[PDB]
């Protein structure tokens, strides 16, 4: 096992903590040992192990930004990286039925997103963070090579429309983009008056990019009414932005499928390809 195997390390990083009481989450690049107030990231390959010093720099940079909330702060690196655990829990889509909850939750997303946008200009950031060229064309090529063979003729025609539209996108690199800003990744303090944003986790996909990507993720998680509220509060409701959001949002099923295809995750692959086959 992973706990028994890394027990010497865990005894140094978590003195007196029984390793069999911990839990391990099985990432792509990393096993993540979860303690009460922190996690230990261990690379699953020599590729990940080589990348971990950069990941630690990235997390240190995010820890320095003004985002209106917490992020996993680097506590120790050695190969391993220890990050603080952000407290709180995801906010259930149903909570947004109360219009006063929706109002304060929308406002706090605007603060988060504004903070990420502003950070996009910073130097610490632009040089620590990934800024790939043509991520969406690379994606289009990956989909055609890897997913089209699994799709129906009608599926391939729908997908080829969605991919064609990715050419409409300007390769915009103005904001820090979380890249996977679903509901599960945004943590809240609940049951102490209206919900207050604790922080944001799962920064694995973080880059310099287009903030439409993060807005699309919010809409995917909470629906169009709520996204519309965020866009209006934040002054982001022009047509140019709406088009970028829709275009990117259209790729989310295919992103799920492409990941699931590479991961040998048959449940996610099936779910991802629903209506493409």
């Amino acid at each position: 096992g992973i706990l028994q195997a890394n027990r010497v390390l865990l005894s140094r990083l978590l003195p007196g903590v029984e390793p069999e009481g911990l839990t391990v989450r099985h990432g792509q690049f990393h096993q993540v040992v979860i303690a009460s107030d922190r996690v230990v990231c261990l690379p699953r390959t020599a590729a990940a192990a080589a990348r971990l010093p950069r990941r630690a720099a990235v997390m240190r940079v995010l820890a320095g930004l003004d985002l209106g909330c917490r992020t996993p702060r680097p506590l120790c690196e050695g190969p391993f990286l220890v990050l603080s655990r952000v407290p709180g829990a995801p906010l259930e889509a149903d909570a947004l039925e109360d219009s006063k909850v929706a109002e304060v939750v929308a406002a706090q997303y605007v603060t988060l997103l504004s903070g990420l946008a502003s950070a996009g200009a910073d130097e610490k950031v632009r040089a620590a963070l990934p800024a790939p060229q043509g991520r969406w064309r690379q994606f289009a090529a990956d989909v055609r090579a890897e997913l089209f063979p699994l799709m129906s003729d009608g599926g391939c025609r729908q997908a080829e429309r969605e991919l064609a539209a990715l050419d409409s996108l300007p390769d915009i690199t103005e904001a820090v983009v979380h890249g996977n800003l679903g509901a599960e990744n945004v943590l809240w303090v609940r049951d102490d008056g209206l919900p207050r944003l604790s922080g944001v986790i799962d920064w694995d996909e973080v880059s310099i990019g287009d903030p439409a990507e993060d807005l699309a993720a919010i809409g995917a998680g909470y629906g169009k009414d709520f996204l519309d509220q965020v866009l209006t509060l934040g002054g982001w409701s022009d047509r140019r932005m709406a088009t970028r959001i829709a275009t990117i949002r259209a790729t989310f099923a295919l992103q799920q499928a492409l990941s699931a295809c590479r991961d040998g995750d048959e449940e996610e692959l099936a779910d991802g390809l629903t209506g493409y086959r």
């Binding site: 890249g179 996977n180 800003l181 679903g182 993720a217 992103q255 799920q256 996610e268």
Partner: peptide, 6 residues
């Protein structure tokens, strides 16, 4: 995991 992107 997942529709948001994962």
């Amino acid at each position: 995991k997942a529709x948001r992107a994962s």
